[PDB]
Amino acid sequence: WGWLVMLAAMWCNGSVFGIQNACGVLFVSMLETFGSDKMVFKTAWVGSLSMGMIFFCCPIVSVFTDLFGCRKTAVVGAAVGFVGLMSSSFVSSIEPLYLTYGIIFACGCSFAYQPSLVILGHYFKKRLGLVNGIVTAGSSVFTILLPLLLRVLIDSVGLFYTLRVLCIFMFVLFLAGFTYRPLNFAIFKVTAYAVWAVGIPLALFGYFVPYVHLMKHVNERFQDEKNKEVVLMCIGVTSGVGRLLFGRIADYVPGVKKVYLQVLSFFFIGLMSMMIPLCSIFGALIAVCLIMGLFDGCFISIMAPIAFELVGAQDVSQAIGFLLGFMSIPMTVGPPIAGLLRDKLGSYDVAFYLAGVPPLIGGAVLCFIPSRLEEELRRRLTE
Ligand SMILES: N[C@@H](Cc1cc(I)c(Oc2cc(I)c(O)c(I)c2)c(I)c1)C(=O)O
Structure with a gap:
């Protein structure tokens, strides 16, 4: 396992927040697809809920992870995120999106991401902070690069295909989740x-x-x-x-x-x-x-x-x-x-x-x- 714990933590931190920050590049075309009235008021909730639910759900994960164990809850977060991203496909109206994207996707992402810190702790039971800086430098790559990929990807295949394809990141996160294994x-x-x-x-x-x-x-x-x-x-x-x-x-x-x-x-x-x-x-x-x-x-x-x-x-x-x-x-x-x-x-x-x-x-x-x-x-x- 070794350093791969940190290597996969990099991928997790990139995968969550790169999407959460590229949200605008989705929004620009999501507004156009199935467009109108007063659309700009409703649509913003799609990303607003996604970004708020992660923070709302992070504290409660501190009971789940301690209850089940470090290895679990990451597989579950990744699987739930994959399910939500897929379910975002096959939607003919904006109304279900608040539930498919946002609620479900973020309720998965928070579970996926929270346990990463508890196991970065014990990375090598030392040298904390430097590992965090390395992870931040890594996730900088995904924050920088993802907007470029998505912008060219959208025009080839519409929003639905784009969300149906972004499941690759969640799938890789699910696979990498198996590395985690501890050893008011x-x-x-x-x-x-x-x-x-x-x-x-x-x-x-x-x-x-x-x-x-x-x-x-x-x-x-x-x-x-x-x-x-x-x-x-x-x-x-x-x-x-x-x-x-x-x-x-x-x-x-x-x-x-x-x-x-x-x-x-x-x-x-x-x-x-x-x-x-x-x-x-x-x-x-x-x-x-x-x-x-x-x-x-x-x-x-x-x-x-x-x-x-x-x-x-x-x-x-x-x-x-x-x-x-x-x-x-x-x-x-x-x-x-x-x-x-x-x-x-x-x-x-x-x-x-x-x-x-x-x-x-x-x-x-x-x-x-x-x-x-x-x-x-x-x-x-x-x-
Ligand atoms: N919009 C930002 C996203 C972002 C917002 C916050 I606020 C933040 O601060 C923390 C600190 C800790 I410690 C946490 O456990 C959590 I969750 C969030 C971090 I890091 C990233 C971006 O452009 O990347």
Whole structure:
């Protein structure tokens, strides 16, 4: 088995999130097929539910995996994902899609992906973090490359065939799953965690809007767009390097003392989102995309260490579970509201601005977290 555990974990992490991020390239043609009324409002749910259900289901998997074992639940996740992707075929209306794609597919994907971490632990009972960086660099490949394959694949055979063929990834995941073989509400009393856990979800209330609506905002330059997929590929091409660099950066002395760089990340990503609906020359959009992706990777990379910095090591699991439970909502509610925001009398021009407000509030809230304080001074002032 050996290193193949990490090798297959790479494939799993790529397979799930590459699709979840290429969702837009599906959406652009899914809207066209079996098209209308008020379609843009309904369709967004197809990807919104898919992205929300993974986070909603991740915490509960911590009971299933511990109940059945590490080897299981990965086979089951892969099989359920394959069943859902296949069932997405033979659908003559958009209504069943919410159930075939989304609910079923993500309820499979979360089961497939969650146990990967528990077995990356014990990879070699050492050298954690470096393995995670390797896996991130690997999944960067699938995030970068998949949009190119799907874009050319769609025109040859329609959406139905595309989803019926994407089952190859789930099948390979199912086969690789055989490698795995091993060989609570009291948290809120901590004020720092209480503030942070509300700050982050309030910050991400527009994070997933671009990943869904950017490919449809494109075609504003209907003629000059000799190539579209690059504009979405260059988000991941920068996210990979950003995560890789910030993994190294996090622990270095000049900035490891107490990290609040997530405030900077939110500020920059919000500003760049506020920049999209204005730039006209093509290259400016790619520059904005790179600026977005770099900090998008940085913020996600820096998250986990803050978890055990704020709270003891024992409660990190519960902390992450609650955090993902809260995070389930904003990504489900974002894209639909963003689409509808001016689906009457306008375009995304008026919708991308308001997608940029929540990040600033989130950054302020996170910057409003106390520290460097202890109660030994309580004798002096308030008593
Ligand atoms: N849109 C992103 C997808 C993505 C979102 C989040 I939020 C995230 O952060 C975590 C951290 C831990 I730790 C988890 O167990 C989980 I599940 C998600 C990661 I990694 C990836 C992209 O472009 O790839």
